[PDB]
Amino acid sequence: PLIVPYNLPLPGGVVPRMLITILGTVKPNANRIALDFQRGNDVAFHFNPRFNENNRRVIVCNTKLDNNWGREERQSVFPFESGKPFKIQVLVEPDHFKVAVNDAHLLQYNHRVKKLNEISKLGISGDIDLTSASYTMI
Ligand SMILES: CO[C@@H]1[C@@H](n2cc(-c3cc(F)c(F)c(F)c3)nn2)[C@@H](O)[C@@H](CO)O[C@H]1S[C@@H]1COC[C@H](n2cc(-c3cncnc3)nn2)[C@H]1O
Ligand SMILES: [Cl-]
Ligand SMILES: [Cl-]
Ligand SMILES: [Cl-]
Ligand SMILES: [Cl-]
Ligand SMILES: [Mg+2]
């Protein structure tokens, strides 16, 4: 039981081999969820499950620079279910973020923002009950 939207500080930003783990439960009749890895006002990595975009479930990922969204990267593999407990793991790798949901690889997102050590906050928003948000090095 964390309040959403939630901000998780990432002290000194991110680095390869840093693992961020988000645990929560999707609300019944969910519409949207977002994780925003921020570099100040920029969004280095936005990870955004949409439960009803034109009656399809899709994951949208993108980057926001100087208040402008870039080119979306879309994934129709959709591992979330309304009402169910989930685990999102975001592993920072040298060239990409790697995302696994419920221990199954979902997607990678190549780094657009290159100053990894300035990506110093993770925002968590949308239609979830949030249980925990933490990080470790592996
Ligand atoms: C509603 O605005 C979103 C942005 N967004 C989401 C949130 C958000 C905030 C929260 F508090 C949340 F809890 C939360 F989950 C999400 N805040 N900003 C962000 O997700 C951004 C990422 O690019 O998208 C915009 S909507 C963007 C607008 O312009 C057209 C884009 N469009 C449509 C299609 C297309 C392609 N193929 C098939 N069908 C439709 N393709 N592109 C569309 O996706
Ligand atoms: Cl959205
Ligand atoms: Cl659903
Ligand atoms: Cl940068
Ligand atoms: Cl930041
Ligand atoms: Mg590569």
Side-chain angles (χ1 to χ4, degrees), residues 64-120 122-127:
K64 195 170 73 175
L65 301 175
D66 293 339
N67 246 26
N68 298 313
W69 290 108
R71 175 177 304 290
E72 289 180 351
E73 297 185 25
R74 284 163 167 269
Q75 176 55 299
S76 289
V77 175
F78 193 92
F80 300 96
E81 296 290 332
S82 287
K84 296 200 197 190
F86 67 84
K87 178 173 69 178
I88 304 166
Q89 290 166 316
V90 181
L91 183 54
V92 182
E93 293 281 36
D95 280 339
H96 55 252
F97 298 93
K98 188 180 73 198
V99 182
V101 177
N102 302 341
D103 293 310
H105 176 66
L106 180 59
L107 63 78
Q108 310 179 344
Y109 186 89
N110 287 333
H111 294 309
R112 304 187 189 171
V113 173
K114 319 276 170 197
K115 289 175 178 166
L116 297 179
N117 73 356
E118 293 187 357
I119 301 173
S120 303
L122 170 58
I124 304 168
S125 57
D127 300 327

